[PDB]
Amino acid sequence: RPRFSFSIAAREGKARTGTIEMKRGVIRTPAFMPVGATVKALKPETVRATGADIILGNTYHLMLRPGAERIAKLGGLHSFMGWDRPILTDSGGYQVMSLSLTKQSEEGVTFKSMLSPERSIEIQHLLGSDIVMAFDECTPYPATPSRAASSMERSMRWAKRSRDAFDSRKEQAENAALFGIQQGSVFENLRQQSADALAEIGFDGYAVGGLAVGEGQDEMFRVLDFSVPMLPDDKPHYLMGVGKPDDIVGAVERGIDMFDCVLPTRSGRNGQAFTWDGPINIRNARFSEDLKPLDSECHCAVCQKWSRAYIHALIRAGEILGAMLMTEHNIAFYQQLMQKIRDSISEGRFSQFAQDFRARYFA
């Protein structure tokens, strides 16, 4: 396989389906990347069995414990966790702000639990990342135009530093890919300047950053409407941190190819199970004697084998197996959503799928 080749097989409106080929495997797009030293409560073989082609590696957590240098000495993240397919690593930038006494500078971020663009790229190399994210400065929402422009402009300077660090490391440049991140908050002219700056630098894929920040779906969709067409059409478009199932459908209708979020895993452990008729909270007493699977059509192993009543009891008792089964199902449901999206685009009926999906999911 090549280092990186994105091929679009079918289109319907702004939606696309196709494949990214990389050394460690093929990624079917639109793709959902489960977030994980683990994808919580799941063995890697189980993540793969649900249909995931690629996972997202949480860099901020790993650079602290067990540390990037240690993981490198132990053979890299793939060997460490036992996942031999592609891994996309975030840059550490967002969580360094959300989770750390930070001091921001043009050089980078200094924090207590210095992360620069150069160090972020090096850490992702040490982890053995297949898709490396440029290191950027997250923009809070809401943001004033001046603050959004300043942060975006710094992020574009850091995008150039990220590109150069990546390219200067021969083994990384020859075996991994690098994505740039569009910033600019909700302002169309800043999104355009960022898209232009990233395209001048040149990346293997382009992320739409700064939209998983509590602005609401109407505003997110409005911003995607003008922001995705600014990105190069022949490269993957990655919406970072999104999202709920209807968000994903709407984002694909607007040209997005790649997705990640913690919602299926986190809310799974919290007792929320996704179904084609909308989410349910399995903790509710009305499931205590319900012998049906979590979802009536889901093909996952959990829905083949256990009832709502059993999982309700496990989650009520705080059982680890409750978290395992809820997470497997939710992750499988997301992958089955992506498969239905990919198939419907391939067959030129994605518009009808989106309408049918929403009618039933919000009924």
Given the residues 130, 204, 247, 260, the one annotated as active site:
260
Identity of the residue, 50 or 139, whose beta carbon is nearer to Zn ion in the bound complex? 50
**Is 261 labelled a binding residue?**
no
Here the contacts of 233-238 (C-beta below 8 Å, separation 24 or greater) are 234/6, 234/8, 235/6, 235/203, 235/204, 235/205, 235/206, 236/6, 236/20, 236/29, 236/179, 236/204, 236/205, 236/206, 237/205, 237/206, 237/207, 237/208, 238/179, 238/205, 238/206, 238/207, 238/208
| 68 versus 294: smaller Cβ distance to Zn ion | 294
Residue 303 is a binding residue for Zn ion (CB under 5 A): yes
Q: How far is the CB of 36 from its own copies (least distance, A)?
A: 9
Is 136 marked within a binding site? Answer: yes
Give kind and range of the element (H or E) at residue 170: helix 170-175
User: Binding residues for Zn ion, how many (CB under 5 A)?
Assistant: 5
Q: Closest approach of Cβ 125 to its own copies, in Å?
A: 19
Closer residue to its own copies (CB): 189 or 284: 284
Residue type, 233: D
Binding partner at 37 among Zn ion, its own copies, none, C-beta below 5 to 8 Å by kind: its own copies
**Applying CB under 5 A, does 300 fall inside the site for Zn ion?**
yes
Mapped onto helix, strand or coil, the DSSP state of residue 130 is coil
Say which entry of Zn ion, its own copies, none residue 6 contacts (CB below 5 to 8 A, set by partner kind).
Answer: none
CB 330 within 8 A of CB 300: no
Residue 260 bears catalytic tag:
yes
Q: Is 183 annotated as a binding residue?
A: yes
What is the C-alpha to C-alpha distance for residues 141 and 138, in angstroms, rounded to an integer? 10
d(CA 197, CA 317): 53
CB of 330 to its own copies, least distance (A): 14
Q: Is 331 in the site for Zn ion (CB under 5 A)?
A: no
Minimum separation from the CB atom of position 66 to its own copies (A) = 5
Q: Where do contacts with its own copies occur on this chain (CB under 8 A)?
A: 37-38, 40-43, 65-66, 70, 73-75, 80-82, 288-289, 291, 305-307, 309-310, 313-314, 316-317, 319-321, 323-324
Active site residue: 53, 90, 204, 257, which one? 90
Tell me whether residue 299 is annotated as binding. Answer: no
**Among residues 183, 85, 99, 90, which one has the least CA distance to residue 137?**
183
| Tokens read off for 280 | 């349910």
CB-facing half-sphere around the CA of 160: CA atoms within 13 A = 12
Catalytic annotation present for 247: no
Beta bridge partners of 10: 17
Q: Is 90 annotated as a binding residue?
A: yes
Q: Rule CB under 5 A: is residue 109 a binding residue for Zn ion?
A: no
Q: Which does 329 bind (CB under 5 to 8 A by kind): its own copies, Zn ion, none?
A: Zn ion
Burial (Cβ within 10 Å: 0-12, 13-18, ≥19) of residue 117: buried
Question: Which residue's CB is nearer to Zn ion, number 248 or number 332?
Answer: 332
Q: Give CA–CA dist 351/345, Å, rounded.
A: 8
User: Which segments are annotated as binding site?
Assistant: 90-94, 136, 183, 210, 298, 300, 303, 329
What residues act catalytically? 90, 260
Q: Which residues are annotated as a binding site for substrate?
A: 90-94, 136, 183, 210
